[PDB]
Nucleic acid binder design. Sequence first.
DNA 1: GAGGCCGCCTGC
DNA 2: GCAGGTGGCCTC
Length: 815
Amino acid sequence: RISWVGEAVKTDGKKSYYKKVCIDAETLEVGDCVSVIPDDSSKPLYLARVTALWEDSSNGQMFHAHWFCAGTDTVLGATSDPLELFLVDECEDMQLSYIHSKVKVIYKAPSENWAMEGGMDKTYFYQLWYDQDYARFESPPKTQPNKFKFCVSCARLAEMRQKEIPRVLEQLEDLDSRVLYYSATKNGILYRVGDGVYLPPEAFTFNIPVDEDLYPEHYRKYSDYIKGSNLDAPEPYRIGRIKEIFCPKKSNGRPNETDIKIRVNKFYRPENTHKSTPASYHADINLLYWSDEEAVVDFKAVQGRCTVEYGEDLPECVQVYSMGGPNRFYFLEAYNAKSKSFEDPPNHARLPKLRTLDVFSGCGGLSEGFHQAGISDTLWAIEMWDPAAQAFRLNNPGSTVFTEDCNILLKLVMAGETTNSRGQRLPQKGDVEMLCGGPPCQGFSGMNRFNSRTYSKFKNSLVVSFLSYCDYYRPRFFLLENVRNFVSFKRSMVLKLTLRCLVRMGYQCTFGVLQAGQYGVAQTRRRAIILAAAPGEKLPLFPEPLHVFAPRACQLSVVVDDKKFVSNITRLSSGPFRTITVRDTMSDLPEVRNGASALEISYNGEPQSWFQRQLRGAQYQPILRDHICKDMSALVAARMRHIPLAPGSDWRDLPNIEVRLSDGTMARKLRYTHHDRKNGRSSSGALRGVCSCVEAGKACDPAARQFNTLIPWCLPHTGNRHNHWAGLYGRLEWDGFFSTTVTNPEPMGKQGRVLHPEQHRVVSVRECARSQGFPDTYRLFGNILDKHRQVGNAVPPPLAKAIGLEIKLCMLAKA
DNA sequence: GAGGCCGCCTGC
DNA sequence: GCAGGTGGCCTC
Ligand SMILES: Nc1ncnc2c1ncn2[C@@H]1O[C@H](CSCC[C@H](N)C(=O)O)[C@@H](O)[C@H]1O
Ligand SMILES: [Zn+2]
Ligand SMILES: [Zn+2]
């Protein structure tokens, strides 16, 4: 049968504990690993570590099973090592009758000389702990012993439970109906009387028909959807100052400490006063107004903690305070809602950087963000394209910039070479502490029709070149950025093989999708991010959103092999700061014409928004650089001049007129040869089809093509299968956001919403840089198309900065 | 170079 | 059907 080895060690109620057991041949101990056959006989064997052995008074002999995770059930899937398992926080008590056999598993700890093992290329083994929800591989926790029957998974799942439960800490006074407290804790955050709190926007309230003859293609706007619009963006958090923490005293009288309430003073954002949304235009994004309005909410509703300080009692200035920490707000005046006026507030309101190598550096958007975060000095940068190399050099005088193929340069280092052919010193093992880069996006971009032409192999891709840098140099931290489609390209195989390489090297790693607009730009730009960290390090979290942003642009979850993954991000429906708009981004720039080429002009005025104050910098700038526009042809310029200024205007609003051009001498009038039965006809009975495509799908006749037309011919030609080419020749809206900033803004590109909100022209280089969050002092290089490409390829610095601050926490938390 | 032209997949 | 895709090729 199954008899016990020895006697009992613990006496706990209906369970008699033991230390070791014997099942028919085999002595079994705690710490031993076993196998368990599943109920589904088709499924493979289950594996676990034994952490407890006991006997119940009603049921048979029991044991506690800390489950292992097979690699094939992680995000790796079929690319996993068959013998690799991963620790997880899953466990359960089971009958000893379920144990099939004892199995040996080894722990493959990284070597003490792991950072030098790079470049040199029948038993279960594990090296990493896995999180099934966030696709995180991490070093095994160090939760020591809960002395004998110490399950690792139980210890931290309970520690996670206490961390998440709202608890009061220090009583302050026992009143008639409530018990006042001085402090409370929640999700690891300590709240005390006087602190600031984030609250959901619903926590409390405050005390305050077209003439189809001339515009024929107007019918194609039946969708009534406006790309770039900010009508459905959520409100930012409510902010309040804790006045009381308290619990209902029961009918007996002791406090019910499971039902914690807080009373707060309401803070007004500028846009919450009688001066509505326009009040936000010029104000700092973290300016508040004190108010004497109070509100009671449940402690559970608190979304986080913030600092709200009286402005004039701060020892440093307001800019040094605002730039020196997260979640920092300030106030100067108070708001009297009934008086609708502003009064003075009452009296009762008063690490050394990492040496970084930037591969595919571009002009340096990613490196600039990491520098702003204060974590890195990019001492080496590799960039094959000379104009972008030169841009990087102008902004980073202490950096060694290699205008080199990254493949060639790594081959040189691996062969023992100390310098490149220019005489520049090559980084060696030990020099590189951080490795970051965005490989070209163009092979993964969904707009690329012809990705099926040249690049087919993964072994020969720049992504693998980049991982070879990681393997060779073995940096403390690693970052790879790309377009969102990187996670889904080739049924997610590229994502899975990248993560597979990292764990094979011994790296902790993870991946996620981030929306740049949630970190401080007026732009929808969803980017995939792989983070990795060396074994002795802490793996960074993805940064919590700072700005609210339109929900349709914030779909960040990723399906891989019928398993949905999300990142650690918990701010899903609100955030501390309002959204950044096209107005915030470029309302201060002077008017220029189509084809403006003056490289250095006057600003003609001071910065207007917080965002412009931040990007123009503290030091006075007498000259505005690179506010230059592509010189569009007479036809295209004539098209832009008749795109209405109203929000949502694009090619579909173009009049059907002939127009004399500046230097094209005439633009022809497109007319509807054949009929579209799907779309019908307009008030006049006009055909509504422009080619032989729209009848029965037969073929295009070249006679139906109409050259040099004002309404471009190719857009009605294929609009029915392209959603009416929405956005092409489209204007931005002052209250909206940019669509994705691309390398060459052109009104008939797929991302065609490139027209200025008021001027008859494509957005300038400076405006594109502003949409990416570049400081106005950030140097670009080359002709105007070179400059557009450097900006369009770049990681927005505010996004890179947010990621970098997460890396900073890991630098501080290690030692 | 400048511009016109414009597939296919994902996710809903 | 709708909405989104740091775009590329081909012809002048
Ligand atoms: N084989 C190669 N070696 C080095 N750089 C390369 C390369 N192939 C392409 N590149 C460069 O890689 C870059 C990808 S775009 C990267 C932009 C950068 N992350 C920023 O924030 O500015 C392009 O600038 C391209 O010129
Ligand atoms: Zn357990
Ligand atoms: Zn046709």
